[PDB]
Structure formats: C-alpha cells, structure tokens
Amino acid sequence: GSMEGILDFSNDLDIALLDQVVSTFYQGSGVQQKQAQEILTKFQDNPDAWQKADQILQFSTNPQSKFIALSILDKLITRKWKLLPNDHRIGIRNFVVGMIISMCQDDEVFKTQKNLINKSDLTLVQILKQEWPQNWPEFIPELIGSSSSSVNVCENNMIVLKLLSEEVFDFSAEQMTQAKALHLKNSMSKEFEQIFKLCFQVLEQGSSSSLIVATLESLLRYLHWIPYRYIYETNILELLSTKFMTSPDTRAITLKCLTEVSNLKIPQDNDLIKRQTVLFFQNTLQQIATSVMPVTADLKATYANANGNDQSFLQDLAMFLTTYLARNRALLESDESLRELLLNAHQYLIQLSKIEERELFKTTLDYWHNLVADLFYEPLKKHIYEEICSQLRLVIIENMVRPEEDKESDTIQLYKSEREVLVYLTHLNVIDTEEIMISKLARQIDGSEWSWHNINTLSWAIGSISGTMSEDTEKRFVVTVIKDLLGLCEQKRGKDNKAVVASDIMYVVGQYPRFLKAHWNFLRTVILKLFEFMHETHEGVQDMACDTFIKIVQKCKYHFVIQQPRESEPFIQTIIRDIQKTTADLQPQQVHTFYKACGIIISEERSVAERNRLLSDLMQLPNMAWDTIVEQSTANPTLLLDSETVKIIANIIKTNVAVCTSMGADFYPQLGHIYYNMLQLYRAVSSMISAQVAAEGLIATKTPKVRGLRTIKKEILKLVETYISKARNLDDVVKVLVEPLLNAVLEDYMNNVPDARDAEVLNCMTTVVEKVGHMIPQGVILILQSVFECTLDMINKDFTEYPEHRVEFYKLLKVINEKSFAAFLELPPAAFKLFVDAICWAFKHNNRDVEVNGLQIALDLVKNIERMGNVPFANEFHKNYFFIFVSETFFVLTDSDHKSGFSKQALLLMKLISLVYDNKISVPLYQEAEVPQGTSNQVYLSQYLANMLSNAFPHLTSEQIASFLSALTKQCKDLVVFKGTLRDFLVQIKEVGGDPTDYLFAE
C-alpha cells in the first residue's frame, strides 16, 4: 500500500504521510485501521526511529504522532541510553526540556494537549533516572526557580515531581537494581526539604485550582515515604482538613492524603502528636457535616442516584473513616469531650454500610469485624458503642448473603465474614439480638416485609448465630422460630411459597445440632419429614432434603447408632429397612448422597461385627443388582453395549464410592465382596473400548457408548483410590489388593492407543505409591515400565495435548521420586536420561500444575543423589547432568516467560551452586582435556557460567557477568539475598551498560 512509505528510512520521513497513517489508525476502522496499525508498530520498532523523533516533535501538528515519537524515545532511554555517544544524550535531554518549556508557555497548547505534556514529563523522568543527580545536580534548584515565573510551569513541575516520586518509591522494586533504587531514594530524600517548601507555599497561597490539585496529587505520593515531621511540625494538616475539604475540586485528593496520613509512622509517646491526630479528624468530620451531608443523610439513596462523583466520594470516605478509626479510635474513647466525634464518625459508617455495593460493603464489614472483636476482648469498651452495635445488628441481619448450604465463592467468603461479626455482636448483647430477630419474624407474618429474599436473609441470619445462646435460651428460641416458620404457610398458599419456607425451616434446624441431640423425638420427626420431602418433585425440594439429611447426620450421628430409650432399635436400622421406599423417587446422585450419609452413621458403630452387619445390610440392593449383572455380563459380554446396563453398572460402583468415602478403612469388607469380580469387569469393559476403537476409529472415544464404558473404568479406579488412601491395614493392601490391580490396569494402559488411555490410571497409581510404595519396590518398577515412556511421548510434542495426563504424570513421578527412588536407579541409562529430559520439560511449562512439580522433582532428585554419597551412580549423575540442570534452570529464570516459578527456580539454582562450593561433588565436572589437572570445580563452574551467560546475553560486559557470578556464588547460603541478586541480574539484562558494582549491594 501507499501508507507503508514511512517504513523506508532511505528517504526523508514525510511527516504528512505519518499523520495520515496515525489518523487512519486512531480514527478509522476495519482494514484501513488494522493496516495502519501494523505499519505504526513496524515503524516504532525500527531501532533507528528515535533519530527521527526530534523532527516529529518540531514539525508534526498531530499530538498522537508526537506521543508515538515519545514512546520511541522512551524505549531508547530505558534500554540503550548508556550506549549512545554522550553528544546524543545531552541533545535528547535538551529538546525534551525545551519541548516541555514551549508547551507550557503557550496557554492554548497547555490546556488542550494534556496527554502529550504528561507523556513528555514522563519521558523527562526517564532521563532523570539515568542522569540525576550525578550528571544534573541543579535539576531541583532550577525546577524550584522556574516554578515562580509561571503558574503553568509550576503546575507541570508538580506533575514531573509526582511521577518522579512514583518511579523512585512506588514502582522501583521491580524495575531497578537494589543499588540504583537506593541511590535515587537517597537523592530525593536529600533534596526534599526544598521540594516541600515549594509545595507548602503553593498550598497556603491558593491560586489556580488546577495548580492546587496538582500539588495535592504530588503530596499524596510524598506521604508514602517522607518523614512524619514534614506532616506534624507544619501547618499542613490544618490546611488539608479545613480549607481543602470545602472545595469539591480539591476534596477528593485531600481526603486521600488524609487517609495516608492516618498511616504515617508516628510515635505513641508524644501527646501533642496525639492531639494533632485528633484535631485533623475533628476538622474533617466537621467539614463533611457542614459542606457535604449531615450524619442523618441517606447515603444508600445518594449512592444509588450516582450523581457526579458522589460514589467515589463515599468510597473514599469509607476508606478514610475505617483507616483512621482502626488505628486511632482509642484516642477518642476516654476524653468525654471527644465522645460525640467518635460516635458521629461511626454513625457515618453505619450509613455507609447500608449502601448497595458489594465491594464497599466488604470494606466497611472488615472494619466492623475489627471493632466488635476489640469490644469482645477489651475491658470497659463495649458500652461506649451500644447504640452503634444495635444498629449494626439490623444492618448485618438484613444484608446477610447465601451460605453454602441453602456456586459463588465470593458469596461464601462474605457469609463467613458476616457470620463472624454477627456472632461477636450476639455475644456482646444476646438479648438485643434475639429481640431484633423475633420482631423481624413478626413482620414476615405481617406480610409487611414478607418476600422470598427477606425470609431467606432472616433464616440465614438466624442460622448463623448458632452457639451464641445458652442451651435454655436457644431451646425456646429455636422452638419459637420453627413455629413461626410453620405457621407462615397457613397464609402463603402455592407450592413455590411452600418450597421457600420448607428450605428455610430445614436450613435453620440443620444449623442447631445441639438442640437436635438433646431432643430425640424431635430429631426423628425432622428426619422422617426430610424423607417425605424426598418424594416431592417440586424443583429443589429433593436436593434440599438430601443435603439437610447428610448435614444433620454428620453432626448427630451418635444418636442414630445407639438405641434410644423408648425405641425398639437403633434408628439406622429403620433407615436401612425402608431405603428402597425412601429413595424410590430420587435421582442417582441424590441416592448416592443418601448412602454416604448412612455410611457416616455406620462408621460410628465400633463393635466390628455390628458395623459389618449394618454395612452388608446397607449394600443389599447394590450387591444384588451387582450379583445379577456379573452373572449376565459374564455369560453374554455383548450386554455391556446396552446403555441401560452400562448406566446400572456405573451407578452401582458410584454407590460403593459414596459409602467408601464416608467409611474409609471400615469399607474393606464390602470392597472384598466385589473386588475380584470388579477387576474382571474392568478387563471386559477395556476390551470393548478397544474393539469399538478398532471397528469405528478414534471417533469412537466420543460416542455415548464408549464414554459410558470408560465411566465404569474411571469409577472403579476412584473406588480403589478412595479406599487405599484411607486404609489402615497396609499389609492387606499389599497382599490382597495391589497385585490384581496392577495386572488389571497397567498393561491395558500401555497397549491402548493414546486417545484411549485413562489419565485416572496415573492418579490411582500415585495413591498406591503414596501409601505403600515403600513396601512394593518391584511394583513401582512395574508401574514405571508400563506408563513412563508411553505417557511421556504423549506430552512432549507441545504443552497443550493431553492436559490431564500431563498433570497426573508429574504427580506420579514426584511421589515415586519421594517414596521409591530406587526404581529410577534400576532404569537403563537411556531411560534415566528421558527422566531428566522429562523434568526439564516440566520447567518450561507455563501451567503451574506442571511447573511446580517439575521444579520440586528436580530439587528432590538432587537431594536423592546427594544422599547416596561418593558412589559411582552419584558421580556419573553429576558428570552427566549437573550442568544440564544449572543451565536449564538459568534459562527459565531469565527468559521472562516463567516468572511464576522464580522462587523455586532460585531455590534449585542455589542448591546446585552450593553443592560445588561445599565440595559435595567428588569428581571433576570437566574433561581431562579442557582444563588443567587440579582445577577446582569452583573455578570451572564460574568459568562455565561466564561463557554460558556471555553467549546467551552478548550485550553484557565481561565485568558485569563476573561481578554477578562472584556475588551469586558468595550468597549461595542466603536465599533472600541470593534472590535479590538474581532480580538485579534480570533488571540489567534488559538494558545496556548496567553498573557491575550493583552486585555489591548486599556487601
């Protein structure tokens, strides 16, 4: 196209052609825009574009074109500054300084091109980081001088200083070496006395509102780091908390400054400091009440209307009040003359807490937790806040959110925080809480506040405070609540209303197990009702009954396993007798929840014979269905293509998993009933999957038929995994379970095509190794032989295919490396080398699941080799793989695509380096040829790394590399400092000419 002409630097740059490209990009659309976009990026990435920037800035009339010219300059200043001839450095400085002066002097330009001026100021600040103060000692005095000659230049100097403070104190940890950050911090500290002078004069003497705002913006930055004396030994707090709170232009920034002041480092001895801290709070609250809104104002309504900047102001006010009062409210609690201020501040917070804004509510709720926790533990404090706490009780009760039981993890977190505060508030005044809740409930029977939302929020609140009342008070409170909830349906007809109320009733009952355990007759009536509900097909009822059933059982199980006074048998027997009836109308996953609940009860029976008898009775139905279809499936293997038979099988095994989940080690007798026929079924299903894949192709793995068959395999593996992870008799695991299992699963996995291998096999094997790996060394060897090479070949052509196999593969290798390292020693050398390859391959993943295990395997392997002492396998390991691990770890450390693993990469690297500098490696890491005899591995390591880094980072000086390695080596016992030195190196490789003395920062 025509636009691509600016990309030809052999001709003079046509400024008008540049502005056409720029306008097409910023103002056009579609292909025009997308094409100019690719041209511009191609333009600004030309490493000679910076030479054409003074042209743009002198002669262009398009401020975007200039902005782009400054970005091109910024890239040069940040990376290649020190490489330029010094003439260009002084030159670039001059026409940035001059371009800024000219833009400030033209009041038309100054008011209408704020983006370009802010970009130019930032560009200047990049020069300052390179040049100041060592090569620019008069920048600050001359900045103070020029400020007096023009409001515009003075305003812009506040912007420059704001940005400089940000770059030096707020964003330097990442982007500078430790030494260079300290140099700039100290340099700013040295000259701040006169920076402050200027800033204080501007504030006291009024002037342009735009100038005042810009000065307060910079002050906000200074407060992050300046000494407290500049804040308390001047008049500035008075100005902030009075003058600048009255004007809406300065109010937002001033409030943020005062929030930071409420965090300064401040001595707690000085009574005059204490009085100044009280005073600026008194002034601020006074200005709010007279200039913004009174304490009575309806902030919920104001926030919802969202006029102008009200919402941001109310957010900022919440942050100010919460920040200040968490640090300083004790300053207000003893002086009777400050009581009104303390309670007015909290009344504002009460009003802020009624706003409908989730994140703001979380901010105020955090503060309430801070308050009520202190009132709960600190003597003589709670009575001060009685009226505040009473209002807070209503606020929290009315804004309670859904607990887990009645998916959204933000809501689960918020409920827990609300519960904590309300529990504290109930301990502080249990009578007030009960009365608020009772009366809220009356107005649910009124109909005056009745609604699905309002009865749920109240039931959750009522449930949330379980444990705060005495048993006797709780007794009549619970009774009263259920009564009122039951009577509620006598007016709310319809099944939708009847469902809400039911769910709330069972939610409240489920939250008060102490009550249920003392009143058996009542607990039984509850359970029998839940069973009734399990035949109710209205949406959500059945799922409600089941979740309530297992929740009550977890808390009250002992009362189902004993025989109760006036009963003929333990109630668990009654449940089991009618289980077919009770569950006849549930879906399979609800049936499984039911069986799991029964297993919870059964495990409370500690007489072995009774527990096993209950267990055999519970499994009667699935065991009969199981026996039936093992007879049929074995006599006619085709039946397993009948989907209905496949689903019955899957549900039987899922039932065994559910019961095994709650019974764990006690499940063993039931496992023994099905074990050998279950693995036979595993073999049969496996053959059918293979036959289908042979007859239909890989697409077979997507059909419902095969997915049904693989569900059986996965559930069998999950059952075995569930039991073994909880077994207490590991001799039986080893002697009875492991051998039939490995014979059933390992060869099938190895000899299936990749798309038909189940990653769950790897997960199951991981659990086997975890629990009994130490007892089955030949079994571990067999696992590796069957899954290692064939799985590796699935996952070593890219980082995306077979994601689950990837994850489980490295979990398996990790556990084997922990529990049975001997198995890797038996690998033939070519296989041990693939193992090393597989570890490094894990390093290079961006997926945390793989990367973390990869770095941990590497670390554990080194420790395993080290333990072996001076023997030949350890010697050959270092000869073969020490420098592979060092260099592979360095690669991911320095390539900028594996930032998330920095800490574990650093740990691994420090361990590797420390081996050599403790002479823990007994043989030379070098060849006979390449180095004189006698050379220490220390000398050779530093030499290998110097050469490695020189070729990998050719723009580093030899001195940089040598200084970095000398420091890194000296620091290989101090991980914190070691890491700091690695960070410094990562900074320096991004630029040219880094200072090698930076690596002496630690000393």
Binding site: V479, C489, F522
Partner: peptide, 14 residues
C-alpha cells in the same frame, strides 16, 4: 410446647 411443634411439623405437607 415442643410437643406442639412436633405435631405441627408432622402435619406440614405438600
């Protein structure tokens, strides 16, 4: 009174 609650709960039905 807990006897009252039980009777009322037993009768609560769809």
């Amino acid at each position: 009174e807990l006897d009252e609650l039980m009777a009322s709960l037993s009768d609560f039905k769809f």
